[PDB]
mmCIF file of N, CA and C in Angstrom:
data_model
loop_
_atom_site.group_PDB
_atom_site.id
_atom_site.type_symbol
_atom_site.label_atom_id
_atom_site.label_comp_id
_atom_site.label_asym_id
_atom_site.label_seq_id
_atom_site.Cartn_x
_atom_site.Cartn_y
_atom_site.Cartn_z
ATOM 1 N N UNK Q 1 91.048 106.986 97.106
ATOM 2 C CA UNK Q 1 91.805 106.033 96.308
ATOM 3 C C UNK Q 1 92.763 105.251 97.188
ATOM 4 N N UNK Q 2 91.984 104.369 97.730
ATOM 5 C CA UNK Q 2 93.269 103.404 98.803
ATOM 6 C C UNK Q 2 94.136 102.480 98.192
ATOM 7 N N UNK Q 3 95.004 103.082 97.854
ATOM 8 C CA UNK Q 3 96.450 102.370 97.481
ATOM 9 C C UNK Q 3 96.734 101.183 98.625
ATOM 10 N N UNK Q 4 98.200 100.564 98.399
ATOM 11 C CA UNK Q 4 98.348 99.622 98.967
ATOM 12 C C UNK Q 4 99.525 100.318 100.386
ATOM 13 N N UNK Q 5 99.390 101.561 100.223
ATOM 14 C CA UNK Q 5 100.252 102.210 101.277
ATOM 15 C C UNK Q 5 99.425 102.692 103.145
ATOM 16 N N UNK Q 6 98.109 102.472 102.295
ATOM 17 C CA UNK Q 6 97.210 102.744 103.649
ATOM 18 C C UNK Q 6 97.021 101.435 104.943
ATOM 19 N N UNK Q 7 96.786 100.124 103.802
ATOM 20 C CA UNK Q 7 96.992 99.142 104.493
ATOM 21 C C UNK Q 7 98.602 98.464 104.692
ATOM 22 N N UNK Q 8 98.811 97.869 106.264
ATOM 23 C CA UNK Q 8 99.949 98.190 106.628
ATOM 24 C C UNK Q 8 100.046 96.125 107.319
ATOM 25 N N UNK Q 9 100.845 95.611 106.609
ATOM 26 C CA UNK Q 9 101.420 94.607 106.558
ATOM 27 C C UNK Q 9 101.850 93.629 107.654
ATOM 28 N N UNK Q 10 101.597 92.941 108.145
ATOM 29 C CA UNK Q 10 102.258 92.246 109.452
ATOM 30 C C UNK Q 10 103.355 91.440 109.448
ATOM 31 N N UNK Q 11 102.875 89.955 109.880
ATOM 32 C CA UNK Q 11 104.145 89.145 109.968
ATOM 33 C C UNK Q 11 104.361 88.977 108.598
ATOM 34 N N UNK Q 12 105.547 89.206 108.101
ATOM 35 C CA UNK Q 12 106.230 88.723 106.747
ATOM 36 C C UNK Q 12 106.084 86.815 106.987
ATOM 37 N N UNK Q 13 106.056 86.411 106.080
ATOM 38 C CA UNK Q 13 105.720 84.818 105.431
ATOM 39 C C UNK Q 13 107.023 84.494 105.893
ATOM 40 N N UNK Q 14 107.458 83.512 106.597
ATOM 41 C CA UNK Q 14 108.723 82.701 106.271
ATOM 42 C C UNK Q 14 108.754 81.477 105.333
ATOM 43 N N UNK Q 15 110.027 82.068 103.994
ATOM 44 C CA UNK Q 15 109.317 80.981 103.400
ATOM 45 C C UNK Q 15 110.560 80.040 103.350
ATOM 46 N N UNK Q 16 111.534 79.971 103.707
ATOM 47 C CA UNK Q 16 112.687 79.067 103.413
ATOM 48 C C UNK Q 16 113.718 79.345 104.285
ATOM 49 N N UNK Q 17 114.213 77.982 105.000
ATOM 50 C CA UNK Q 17 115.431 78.303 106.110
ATOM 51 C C UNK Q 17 116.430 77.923 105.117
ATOM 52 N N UNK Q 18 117.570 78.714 105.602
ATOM 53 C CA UNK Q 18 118.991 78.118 105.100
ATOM 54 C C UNK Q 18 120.084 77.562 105.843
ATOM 55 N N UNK Q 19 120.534 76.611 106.396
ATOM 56 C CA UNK Q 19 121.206 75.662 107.107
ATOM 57 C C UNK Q 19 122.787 76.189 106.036
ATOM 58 N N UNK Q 20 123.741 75.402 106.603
ATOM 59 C CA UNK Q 20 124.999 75.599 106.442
ATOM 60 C C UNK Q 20 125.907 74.453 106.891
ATOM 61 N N UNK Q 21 126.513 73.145 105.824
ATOM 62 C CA UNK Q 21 126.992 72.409 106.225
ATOM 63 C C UNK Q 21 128.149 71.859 105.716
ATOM 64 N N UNK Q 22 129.101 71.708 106.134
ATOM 65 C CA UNK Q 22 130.442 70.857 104.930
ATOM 66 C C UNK Q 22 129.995 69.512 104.512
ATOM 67 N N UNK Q 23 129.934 69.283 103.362
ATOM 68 C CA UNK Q 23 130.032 67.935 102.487
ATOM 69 C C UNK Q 23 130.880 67.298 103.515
ATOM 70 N N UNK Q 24 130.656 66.664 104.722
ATOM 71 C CA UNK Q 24 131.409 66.165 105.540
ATOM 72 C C UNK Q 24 132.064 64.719 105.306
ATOM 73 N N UNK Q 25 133.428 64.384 105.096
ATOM 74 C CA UNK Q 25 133.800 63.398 104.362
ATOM 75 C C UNK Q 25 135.002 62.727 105.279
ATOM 76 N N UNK Q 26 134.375 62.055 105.932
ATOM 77 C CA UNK Q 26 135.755 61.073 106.715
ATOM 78 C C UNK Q 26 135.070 59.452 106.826
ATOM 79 N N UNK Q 27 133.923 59.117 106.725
ATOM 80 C CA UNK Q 27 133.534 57.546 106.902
ATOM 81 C C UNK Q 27 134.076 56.986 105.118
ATOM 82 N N UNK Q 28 134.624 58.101 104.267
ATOM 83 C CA UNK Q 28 135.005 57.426 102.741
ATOM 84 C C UNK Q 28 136.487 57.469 102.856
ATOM 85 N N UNK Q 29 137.110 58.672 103.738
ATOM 86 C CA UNK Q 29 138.332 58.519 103.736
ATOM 87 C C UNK Q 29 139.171 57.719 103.946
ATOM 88 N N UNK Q 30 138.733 57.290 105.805
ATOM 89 C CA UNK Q 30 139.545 56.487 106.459
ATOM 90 C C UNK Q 30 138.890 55.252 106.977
ATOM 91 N N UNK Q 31 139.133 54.261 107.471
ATOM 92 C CA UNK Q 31 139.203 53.299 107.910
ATOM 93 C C UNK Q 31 139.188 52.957 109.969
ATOM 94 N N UNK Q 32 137.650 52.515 110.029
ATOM 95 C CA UNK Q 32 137.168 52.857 111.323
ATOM 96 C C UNK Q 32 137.287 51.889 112.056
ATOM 97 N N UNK Q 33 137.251 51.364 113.242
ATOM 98 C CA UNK Q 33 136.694 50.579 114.172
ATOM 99 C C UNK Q 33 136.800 50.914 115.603
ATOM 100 N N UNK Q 34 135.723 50.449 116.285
ATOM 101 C CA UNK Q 34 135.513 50.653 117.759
ATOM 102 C C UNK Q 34 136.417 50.142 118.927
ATOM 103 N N UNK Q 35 137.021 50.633 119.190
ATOM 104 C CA UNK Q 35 137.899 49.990 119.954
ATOM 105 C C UNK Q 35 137.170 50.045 121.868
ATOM 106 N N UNK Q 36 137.780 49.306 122.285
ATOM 107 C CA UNK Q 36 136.546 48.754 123.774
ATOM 108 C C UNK Q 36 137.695 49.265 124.740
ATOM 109 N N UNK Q 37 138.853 49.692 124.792
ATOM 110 C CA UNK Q 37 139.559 50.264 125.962
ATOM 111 C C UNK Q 37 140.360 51.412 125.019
ATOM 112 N N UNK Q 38 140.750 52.031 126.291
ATOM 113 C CA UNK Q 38 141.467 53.555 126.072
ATOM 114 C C UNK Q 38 142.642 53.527 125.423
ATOM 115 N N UNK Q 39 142.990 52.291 125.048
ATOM 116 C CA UNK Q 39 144.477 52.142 124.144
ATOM 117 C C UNK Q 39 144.230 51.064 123.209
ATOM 118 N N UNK Q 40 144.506 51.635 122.042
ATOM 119 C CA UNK Q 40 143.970 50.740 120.696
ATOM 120 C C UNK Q 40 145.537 50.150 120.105
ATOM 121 N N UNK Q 41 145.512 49.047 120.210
ATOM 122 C CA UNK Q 41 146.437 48.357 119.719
ATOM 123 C C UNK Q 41 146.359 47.508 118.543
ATOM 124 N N UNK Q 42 147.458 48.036 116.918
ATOM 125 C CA UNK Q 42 147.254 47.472 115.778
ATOM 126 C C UNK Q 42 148.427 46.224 115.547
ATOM 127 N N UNK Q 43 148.248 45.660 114.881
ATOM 128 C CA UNK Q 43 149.707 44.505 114.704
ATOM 129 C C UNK Q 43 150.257 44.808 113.164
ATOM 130 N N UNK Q 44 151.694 44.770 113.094
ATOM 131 C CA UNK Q 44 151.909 44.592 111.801
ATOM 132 C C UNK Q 44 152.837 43.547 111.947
ATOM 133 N N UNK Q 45 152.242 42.619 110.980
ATOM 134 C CA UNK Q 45 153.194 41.524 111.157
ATOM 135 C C UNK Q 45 153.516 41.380 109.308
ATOM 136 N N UNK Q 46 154.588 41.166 109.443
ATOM 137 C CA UNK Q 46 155.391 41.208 108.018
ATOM 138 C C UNK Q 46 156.571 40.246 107.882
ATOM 139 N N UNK Q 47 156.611 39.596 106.628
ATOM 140 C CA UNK Q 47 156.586 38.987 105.686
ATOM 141 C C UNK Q 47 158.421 39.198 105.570
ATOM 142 N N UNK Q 48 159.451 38.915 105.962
ATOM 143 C CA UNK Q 48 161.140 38.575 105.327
ATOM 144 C C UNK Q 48 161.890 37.427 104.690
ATOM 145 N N UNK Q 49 162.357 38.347 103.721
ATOM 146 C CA UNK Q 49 163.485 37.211 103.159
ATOM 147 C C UNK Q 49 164.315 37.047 104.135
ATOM 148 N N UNK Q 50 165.591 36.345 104.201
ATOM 149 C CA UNK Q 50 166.371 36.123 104.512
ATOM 150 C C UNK Q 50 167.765 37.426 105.283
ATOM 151 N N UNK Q 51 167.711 38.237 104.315
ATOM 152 C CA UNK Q 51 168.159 39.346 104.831
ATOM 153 C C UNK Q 51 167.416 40.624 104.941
ATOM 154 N N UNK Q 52 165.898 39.766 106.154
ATOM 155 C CA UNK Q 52 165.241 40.401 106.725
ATOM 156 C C UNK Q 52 164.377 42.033 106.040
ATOM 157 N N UNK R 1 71.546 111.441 97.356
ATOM 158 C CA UNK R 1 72.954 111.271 97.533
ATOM 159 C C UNK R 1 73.548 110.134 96.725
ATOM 160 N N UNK R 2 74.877 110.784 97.011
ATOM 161 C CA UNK R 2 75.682 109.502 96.028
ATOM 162 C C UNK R 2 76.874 109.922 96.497
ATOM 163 N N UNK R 3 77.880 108.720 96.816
ATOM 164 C CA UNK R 3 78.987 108.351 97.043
ATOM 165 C C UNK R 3 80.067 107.156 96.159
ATOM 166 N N UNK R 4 81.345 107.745 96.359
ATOM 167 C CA UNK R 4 81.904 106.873 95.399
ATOM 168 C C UNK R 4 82.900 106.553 96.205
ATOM 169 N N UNK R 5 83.865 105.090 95.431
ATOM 170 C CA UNK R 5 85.025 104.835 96.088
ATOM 171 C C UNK R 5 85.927 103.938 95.401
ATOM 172 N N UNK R 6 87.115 104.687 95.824
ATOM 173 C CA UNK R 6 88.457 103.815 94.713
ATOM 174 C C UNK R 6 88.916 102.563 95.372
ATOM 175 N N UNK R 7 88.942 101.866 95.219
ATOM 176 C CA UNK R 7 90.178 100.778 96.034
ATOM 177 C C UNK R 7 90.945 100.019 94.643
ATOM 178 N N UNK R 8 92.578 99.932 94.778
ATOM 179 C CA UNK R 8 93.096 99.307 93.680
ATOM 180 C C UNK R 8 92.921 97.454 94.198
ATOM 181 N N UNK R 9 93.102 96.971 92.625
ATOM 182 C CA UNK R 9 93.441 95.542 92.928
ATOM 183 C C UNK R 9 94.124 94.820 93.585
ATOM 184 N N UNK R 10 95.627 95.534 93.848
ATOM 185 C CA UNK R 10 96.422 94.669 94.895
ATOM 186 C C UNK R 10 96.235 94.946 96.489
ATOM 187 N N UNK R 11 95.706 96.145 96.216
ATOM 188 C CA UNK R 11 95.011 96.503 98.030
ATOM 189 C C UNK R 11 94.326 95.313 98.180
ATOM 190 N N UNK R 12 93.283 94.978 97.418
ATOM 191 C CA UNK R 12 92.440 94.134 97.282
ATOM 192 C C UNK R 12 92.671 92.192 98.109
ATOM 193 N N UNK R 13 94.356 92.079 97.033
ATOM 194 C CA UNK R 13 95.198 90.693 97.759
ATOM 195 C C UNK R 13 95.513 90.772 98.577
ATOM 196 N N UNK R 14 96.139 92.112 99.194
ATOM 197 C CA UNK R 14 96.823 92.527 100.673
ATOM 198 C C UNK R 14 96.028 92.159 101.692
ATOM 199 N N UNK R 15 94.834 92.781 101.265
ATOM 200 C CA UNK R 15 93.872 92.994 102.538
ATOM 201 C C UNK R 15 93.197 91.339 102.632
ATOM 202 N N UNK R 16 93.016 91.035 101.616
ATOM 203 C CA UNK R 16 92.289 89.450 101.961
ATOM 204 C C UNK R 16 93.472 88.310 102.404
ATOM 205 N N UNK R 17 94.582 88.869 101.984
ATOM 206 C CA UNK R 17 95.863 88.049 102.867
ATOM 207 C C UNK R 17 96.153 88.800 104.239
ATOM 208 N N UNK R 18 97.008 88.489 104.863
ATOM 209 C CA UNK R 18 97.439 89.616 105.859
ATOM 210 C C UNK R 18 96.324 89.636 106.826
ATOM 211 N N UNK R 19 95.367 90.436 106.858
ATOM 212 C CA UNK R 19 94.162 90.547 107.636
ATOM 213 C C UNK R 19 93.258 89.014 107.146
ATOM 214 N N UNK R 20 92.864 89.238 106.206
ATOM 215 C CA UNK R 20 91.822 87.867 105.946
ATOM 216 C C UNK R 20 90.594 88.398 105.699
ATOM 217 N N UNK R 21 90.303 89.874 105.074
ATOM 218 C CA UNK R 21 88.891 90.376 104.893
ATOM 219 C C UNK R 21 88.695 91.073 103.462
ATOM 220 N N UNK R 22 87.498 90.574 102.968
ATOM 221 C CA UNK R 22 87.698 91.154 101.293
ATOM 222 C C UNK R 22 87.276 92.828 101.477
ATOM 223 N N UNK R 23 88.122 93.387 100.369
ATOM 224 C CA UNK R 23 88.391 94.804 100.696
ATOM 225 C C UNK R 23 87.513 95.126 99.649
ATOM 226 N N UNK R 24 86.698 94.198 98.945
ATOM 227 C CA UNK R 24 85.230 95.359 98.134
ATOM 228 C C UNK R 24 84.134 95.473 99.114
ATOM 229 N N UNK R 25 83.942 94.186 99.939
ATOM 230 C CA UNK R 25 83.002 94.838 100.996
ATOM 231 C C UNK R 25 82.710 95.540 101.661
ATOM 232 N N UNK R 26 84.143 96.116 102.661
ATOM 233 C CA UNK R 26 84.000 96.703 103.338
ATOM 234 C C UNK R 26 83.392 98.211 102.661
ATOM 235 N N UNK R 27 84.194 98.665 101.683
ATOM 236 C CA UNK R 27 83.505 99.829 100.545
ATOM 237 C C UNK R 27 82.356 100.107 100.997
ATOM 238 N N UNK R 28 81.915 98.908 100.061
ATOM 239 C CA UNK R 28 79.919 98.551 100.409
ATOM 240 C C UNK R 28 79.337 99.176 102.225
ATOM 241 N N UNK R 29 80.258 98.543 102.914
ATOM 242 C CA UNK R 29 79.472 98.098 103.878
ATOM 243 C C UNK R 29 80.060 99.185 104.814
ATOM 244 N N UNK R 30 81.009 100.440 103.854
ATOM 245 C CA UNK R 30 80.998 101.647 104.254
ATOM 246 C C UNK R 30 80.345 102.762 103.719
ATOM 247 N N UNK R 31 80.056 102.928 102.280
ATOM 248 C CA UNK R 31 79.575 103.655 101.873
ATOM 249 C C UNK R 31 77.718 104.050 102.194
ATOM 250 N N UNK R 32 77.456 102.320 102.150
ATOM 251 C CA UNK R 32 75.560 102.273 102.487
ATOM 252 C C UNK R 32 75.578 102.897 103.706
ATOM 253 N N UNK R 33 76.182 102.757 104.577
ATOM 254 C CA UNK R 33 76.128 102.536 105.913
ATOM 255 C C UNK R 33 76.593 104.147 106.465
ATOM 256 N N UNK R 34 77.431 104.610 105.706
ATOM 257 C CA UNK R 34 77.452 106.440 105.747
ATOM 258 C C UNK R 34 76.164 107.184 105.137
ATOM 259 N N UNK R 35 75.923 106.462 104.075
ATOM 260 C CA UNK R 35 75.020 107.916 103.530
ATOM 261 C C UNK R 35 73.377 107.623 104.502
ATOM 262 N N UNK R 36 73.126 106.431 104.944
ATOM 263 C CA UNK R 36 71.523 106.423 105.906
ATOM 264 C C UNK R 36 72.132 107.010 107.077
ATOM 265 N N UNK R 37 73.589 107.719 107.965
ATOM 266 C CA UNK R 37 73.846 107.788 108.966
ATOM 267 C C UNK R 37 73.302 109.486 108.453
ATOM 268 N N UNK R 38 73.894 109.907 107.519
ATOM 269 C CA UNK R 38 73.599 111.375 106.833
ATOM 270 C C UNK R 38 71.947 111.533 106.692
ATOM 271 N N UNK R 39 71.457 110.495 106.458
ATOM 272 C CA UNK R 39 69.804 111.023 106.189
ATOM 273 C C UNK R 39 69.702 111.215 107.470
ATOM 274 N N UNK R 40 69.976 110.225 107.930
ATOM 275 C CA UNK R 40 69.298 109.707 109.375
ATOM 276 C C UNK R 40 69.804 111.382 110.330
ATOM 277 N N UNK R 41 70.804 112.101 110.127
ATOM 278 C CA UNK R 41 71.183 113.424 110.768
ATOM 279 C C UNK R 41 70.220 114.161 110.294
ATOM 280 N N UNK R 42 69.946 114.153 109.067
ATOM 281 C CA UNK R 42 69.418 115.431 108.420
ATOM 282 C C UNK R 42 68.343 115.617 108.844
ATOM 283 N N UNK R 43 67.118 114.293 108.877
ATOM 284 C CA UNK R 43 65.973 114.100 109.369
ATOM 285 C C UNK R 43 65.682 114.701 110.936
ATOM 286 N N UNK R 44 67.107 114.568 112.098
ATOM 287 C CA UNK R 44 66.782 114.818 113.072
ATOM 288 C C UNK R 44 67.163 116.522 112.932
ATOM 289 N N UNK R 45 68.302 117.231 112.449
ATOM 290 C CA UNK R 45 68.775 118.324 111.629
ATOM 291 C C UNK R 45 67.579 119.095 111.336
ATOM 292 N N UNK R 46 66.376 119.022 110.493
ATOM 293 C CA UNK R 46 65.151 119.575 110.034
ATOM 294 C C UNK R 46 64.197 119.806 110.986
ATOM 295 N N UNK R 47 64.601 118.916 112.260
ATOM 296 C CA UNK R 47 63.389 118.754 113.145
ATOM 297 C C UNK R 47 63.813 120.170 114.151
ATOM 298 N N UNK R 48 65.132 119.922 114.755
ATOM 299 C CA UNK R 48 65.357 121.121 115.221
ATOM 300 C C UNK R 48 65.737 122.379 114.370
ATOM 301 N N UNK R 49 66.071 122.401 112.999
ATOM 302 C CA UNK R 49 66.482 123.406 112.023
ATOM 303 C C UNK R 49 64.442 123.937 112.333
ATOM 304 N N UNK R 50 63.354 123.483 112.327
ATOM 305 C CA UNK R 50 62.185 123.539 112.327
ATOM 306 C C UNK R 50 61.519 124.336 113.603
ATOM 307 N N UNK R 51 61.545 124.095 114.632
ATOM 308 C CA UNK R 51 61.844 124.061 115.847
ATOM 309 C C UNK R 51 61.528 125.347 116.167
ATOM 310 N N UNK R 52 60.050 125.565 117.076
ATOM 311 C CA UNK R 52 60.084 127.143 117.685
ATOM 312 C C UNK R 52 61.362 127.165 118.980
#
């Protein structure tokens, strides 16, 4: 009576990888651009009344 | 003569997965194949059982 204990099993099936990643969220956050030298320079130029 | 033999059904999937060979044949293509090895003794068995 050969059960399923006589025959003896090999490579197990791979059936699904599982990866691991953060919902990675900074191109919605902030506000990008490439800057072409090692020191990025912004301007704020603003807008006074009279007593500045 | 007469010979018999059990094999269950899921032996049956195991063996045609895993290995890749159907497991009612081999039965067959053990059982025929034992009992002419048994004549085939007995016949030579009688000759010397015979034998001055």
């Amino acid at each position: 009576s050969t059960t399923t204990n006589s025959n003896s099993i090999g490579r197990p099936n791979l059936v699904a990888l599982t990866r691991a990643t953060t919902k990675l969220i900074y191109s919605d956050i902030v506000a990008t651009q490439r800057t072409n030298q090692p020191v990025a320079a912004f301007y704020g130029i603003k807008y006074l009344n009279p007593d500045n | 003569r007469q010979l018999k033999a059990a094999y269950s059904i899921e032996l049956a999937q195991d063996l045609r997965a895993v290995h890749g060979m159907d497991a009612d044949a081999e039965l067959s293509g053990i059982l025929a194949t034992e009992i002419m090895l048994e004549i085939n003794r007995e016949v030579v068995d009688w000759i010397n059982y015979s034998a001055q």
